[PDB]
Structure 1
Amino acid sequence: SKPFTVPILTVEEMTNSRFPIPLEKLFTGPSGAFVVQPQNGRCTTDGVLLGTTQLSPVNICTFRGDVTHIAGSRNYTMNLASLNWNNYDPTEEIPAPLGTPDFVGKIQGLLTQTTKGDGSTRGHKATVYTGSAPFTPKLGSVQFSTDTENDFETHQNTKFTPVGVIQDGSTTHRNEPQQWVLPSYSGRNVHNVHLAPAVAPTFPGEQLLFFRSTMPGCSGYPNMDLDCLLPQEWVQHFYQEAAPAQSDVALLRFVNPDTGRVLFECKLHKSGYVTVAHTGQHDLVIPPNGYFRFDSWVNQFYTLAPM
């Protein structure tokens, strides 16, 4: 079998696979109070994309299409198009368009538009509430709240570029976004389909290891923590390499090339997530040049040295 590898990029050189921001740190914690089932940043070690995962680090939480104004408001409905501006196909066997947000929250950014005829352009602050009834990306429609009642034109290509998240400051602080709560991609009382599975540690004394970023906050008191299971660069790497998994777990060592010593070891499960031997919440302290290295194929219940 073709030898398996992970990139040698450091954590801070890599990108969150769930929102277009750099990775900041590694974090581990118990995950019993939630279901860890993100749909972006999902890929097997042999390169099979899962859920709503696609390859672009900058086509995550974006939308494209044309918009229609909702009378008596600053709200616009976007009829979704594909990345190359073609009609959206709701019958593809995916949960929602690839790159669709995979958490319930209020994502703020800019809605921009070009008029084809003369190249005139416009841009307005906009928010999408992924927990709202009109959030139906699998059906081909989402709604944005904006700062205009009349500037956007119909039947002109329109893009949403995400920036960060908001919260209602008159309610309990940090109560949203909820990063581990999937939206209902087809709206209220319709089940999600074609999902990447939930993940959890399976061996005693282990926890998931998360690749963590802090989303920009744009209003209120949001929970800005965002954990992904794989860096976007790992998704791109496995997709290209397509090296076969020789067991259920790739043992990785995290090495400091400065001192030449292994800092810790972890399990990269072939379905695309990482666990470590630790109990409790912990922000890992790592050197800037630290990187992960594949060392060997082991079994699911291999006993790791404590992190």
Structure 2
Amino acid sequence: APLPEATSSMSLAPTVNSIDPWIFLNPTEVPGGTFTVASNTQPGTMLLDIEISPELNIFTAHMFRMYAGWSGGFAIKLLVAGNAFSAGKLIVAIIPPNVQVPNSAYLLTGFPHEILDFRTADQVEIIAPDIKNLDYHFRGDKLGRLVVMVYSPLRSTATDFEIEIKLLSAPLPDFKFTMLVPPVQNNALPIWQIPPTPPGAMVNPRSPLTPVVDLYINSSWTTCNHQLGRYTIDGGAIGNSTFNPSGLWTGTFTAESGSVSGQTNWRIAMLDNPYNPTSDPTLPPVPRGFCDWGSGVKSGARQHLVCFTGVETDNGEGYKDVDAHMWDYGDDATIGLDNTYQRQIYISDPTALDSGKRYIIIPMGASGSATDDTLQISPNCYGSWDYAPTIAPPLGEQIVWFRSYLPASSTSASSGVNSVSAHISSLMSPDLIRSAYVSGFPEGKAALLDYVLYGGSVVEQFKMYREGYLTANATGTNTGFIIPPDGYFRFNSWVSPTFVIGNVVDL
């Protein structure tokens, strides 16, 4: 116990409550309180920054949804799962509120601290008190976090094996709830119910009309710059993504009676944005949910084909004469507009284009000599509208990409088209992420979940972060390992973002 506890009289808190006496005796595991230390962790790194609250125990985190006030501290105990060769030192400190958490062991030592080495080979325990200046906290600024750091690295003498540390907790004899008036449904939960929906029955946000066939992981793609399928728990649909990919796939554009220099057949046109009529820089330029496939930096050689496009029927009741055509962003000449994700596009057609008449487009397919690597990169966007930033996983981890097979739609005609089959991948399907809104993630925590195959004979483990991407550790270098979709995700636990997956990919 590095710091004394408060009495928590609760004199002026009406209708104080008494909880089950058996909870104080049977300690459970803290939800977000497991982590690991490896041989290559940087000294002075923050492994755990959980805060004192009623969410440090399975029972009081589920019972807390009925009340609106609490006051009391916890008594936690460390399970180390140590070794016989390693040697290092940990550090645990209590941080009072209204205090910028120090990000250096030098400064962290100036706090109620206790230093534990790895050669203790036992299970110590520490008391976490609640620093309150009020009679009892309701649900607000519940600081008093429990930062845990690495004072000295573990240079193991022999095998460089890892250490997994977890925490068990139990309320102090002075922990009480107050004012059970709020019935239900206020805050987070200790569990997450993932329905057993196979990925083979999920929609692909970046390419509808094509079912997901496999899960694809590739070593060369170490970053993502997509603008469709970007979902976050905190922000919902972020960037230009939406929750109905199928509904918003078809688009409409208007001609402008012109052509770019060099090639006259590239009729210029402008896209229509009902959401942002005026070209205000603070809103997305293109209509929401429209394609963002990449085609190259600047090369007329290949050009994704718009496939089905149609002319106005002069009646206002639809369109006419759907034909297979090819399109592209920008002009393939200007460096500042070749790949910018903007309104102006060009469509290749030998015949003249109806000026001032709108057309319907259903983009599906790519033409030229384009490969999956060309399509994987997305045209970068510049401007003022809040767009999805580029994402890179931590070192030693990959990304699961929900790849799907895109057939070819060519023609034998005068102009022709060299469209070829390919594969298109998306960051995360909306079906999986949509479920985790009833019971949101605990703050600054990732979810460790399992993917089982056959009758459970082979189980892989994935870690899902806050922004919605899954890592799967590494086994070696390959052209992209393929996982069948004949399985269901199963929730396993909550882990820190720095957790290292135990099970490896196994080829």
Q: TM-score, normalised by structure 1?
A: 0.78
For residue 425 of structure 2, give the secondary structure of its aligned residue in structure 1. Answer: strand
Q: Shift in Å at residue 102 of structure 1?
A: 2.7
Do residues 111 (structure 1) and 309 (structure 2) align?
Answer: yes
**1:87 matched to which residue of 2?**
277
Q: 1:265 aligns with which of 438, 461, 474?
A: 461
How far apart are residue 96 of structure 1 and its match? 4.4
- Alignment counterpart, residue 143 of structure 1, candidates 346, 351, 355: 346
Task: List gaps (5 residues or longer) in structure 1.
Answer: none
CA contact (8 A) 2:192 2:439 kept: yes
Indicate conservation of the 8 Å contact 1:113/1:122, yes or no. yes
Map 1:265-284 onto structure 2 (within 5 A). Answer: 265-278=461-474, 279-281=476-478, 282-284=480-482
Q: How does 1:99-178 map to 2 (within 5 A)?
A: 99-105=289-295, 106-108=303-305, 109-115=307-313, 117=315, 119=317, 121-130=320-329, 132=332, 133=334, 139-146=342-349, 148-150=351-353, 152=354, 154-156=356-358, 158-168=359-369, 174=371, 177-178=374-375
Distance 1:46 1:10 in 2: 25
Instruction: Determine if contact 2:407/2:421 at 8 Å carries over to the other structure.
Output: no
Residue 18 of structure 1 pairs with residue 216 of structure 2: no
**2:408 aligned to which of 190, 200, 217:** 217
1:207 aligned residue (393, 398, 423): 398
| Residue 179 to residue 209, structure 1, CA distance change in 2 (3 Å) | same
CA contact (8 A) 1:66 1:155 kept: yes
**Greater CA deviation, 247-256 or 129-138?**
129-138
C-alpha change, 1:192 and 1:17, in structure 2 (3 Å) is: farther
| Alignment partners' CA distance in 2, 1:214 and 1:30 | 19
Task: For residue 118 of structure 1, report the CA deviation from its aligned partner.
Answer: 5.9
CA distance in 1, matches of 2:328, 2:243: 24
Cα deviation for residue 47 of structure 1 reads: 5.8
Quick one: structure 1 residues 118 and 229, their matched pair in 2 at CA, closer, same or farther if it must change by over 3 Å?
closer
Q: State the Cα deviation string for residues 183-213 of structure 1 (Å, max 9, x = none).
A: 144xxxx568533122222153x21111111
Change over 3 Å in CA distance of 1:149–1:253 after alignment to 2: same
Question: Does the Cα contact within 8 Å between 1:40 and 1:54 map onto a contact in 2?
Answer: yes
- Given that 1:81 and 1:87 are in contact with CA atoms closer than 8 Å, whether structure 2 keeps it comes out as yes
The one-letter amino acid of 2:213's match is: E
Contact kept in structure 1, 2:402 and 2:428, CA below 8 Å: yes
Per-residue deviation, residues 50-108 of structure 1 (Å, max 9, x unmatched): 2211122225664323333436536241341327xx83654344474322333322332
Checking the alignment, whether the CA contact within 8 Å between 1:96 and 1:137 is kept in structure 2 is no
Aligned partner letter, 1:26: L
Report the CA distance shift for 1:262/1:52 in structure 2 as closer, same or farther (over 3 A).
same
CA contact (8 A) 2:309 2:323 kept: yes
**How many Å separate the matches in 2 of 1:196 and 1:75?**
31
Shift of 1:226: 1.7
263-272 or 114-123: bigger deviation = 114-123
Moved more, 272-281 or 219-228: 219-228
Aligned equivalent of 2:265: 73
**How far apart, CA to CA, are the structure 2 residues paired with 1:99 and 1:40?**
7
Moved more, 45-54 or 93-102: 93-102
Structure of larger gyration radius: 2
Partner of 2:498: 301
CA shift, 1:250, in A, is 1.1
Percent of pairs with identical residues: 21
Relative to its length, the structure with more strand (as a share) is 1
Contact 2:462 2:471 in 1 (8 A): yes
2-side partners of 1:123 and 1:23: how far apart? Answer: 27
Residue 171 of structure 2 is aligned to residue 9 of structure 1: no
Query: Is the 2:368–2:418 contact (alpha carbons within 8 Å) kept by the matching residues of 1?
Result: yes
Q: Aligned partners of 2:217, 2:231: CA distance in 1, in Å?
A: 20
Q: Is residue 481 of structure 2 the alignment partner of residue 292 of structure 1?
A: no
How many pairs are equivalent? Answer: 288
SS in 1 for 2:371: coil
Q: CA 1:262–1:163 in structure 2 vs 1: closer, same or farther (change >3 Å)?
A: same
1:37, 1:118 → 2: CA distance?
38
Separation of aligned partners in 2, 1:7 and 1:46: 21
Higher-RCO chain (CA-CA 8 Å, sequence separation at least 6): 1
- Matches of 1:207 and 1:154, distance apart in 2: 48
Query: Given the superposition, is the C-alpha separation of residues 184 and 299 from structure 1 closer, same or farther in structure 2, using an over 3 Å criterion?
Result: closer
Conserved 8 A contact 1:90-1:138: no
Q: Which residue of 1 aligns with 2:228?
A: 40
**Aligned-pair distance for 1:306?**
0.9
Q: Provide the rounded CA distance (Å) in 1 between the counterparts of 2:214 and 2:232.
A: 22
User: Retained in 2: the 8 A contact 1:46–1:245?
Assistant: no
Bigger Cα displacement from structure 2, 122-131 vs 218-227: 218-227
Q: Does 1:53 align with 2:241?
A: yes
Contact 1:125 1:147 in 2 (8 A): no
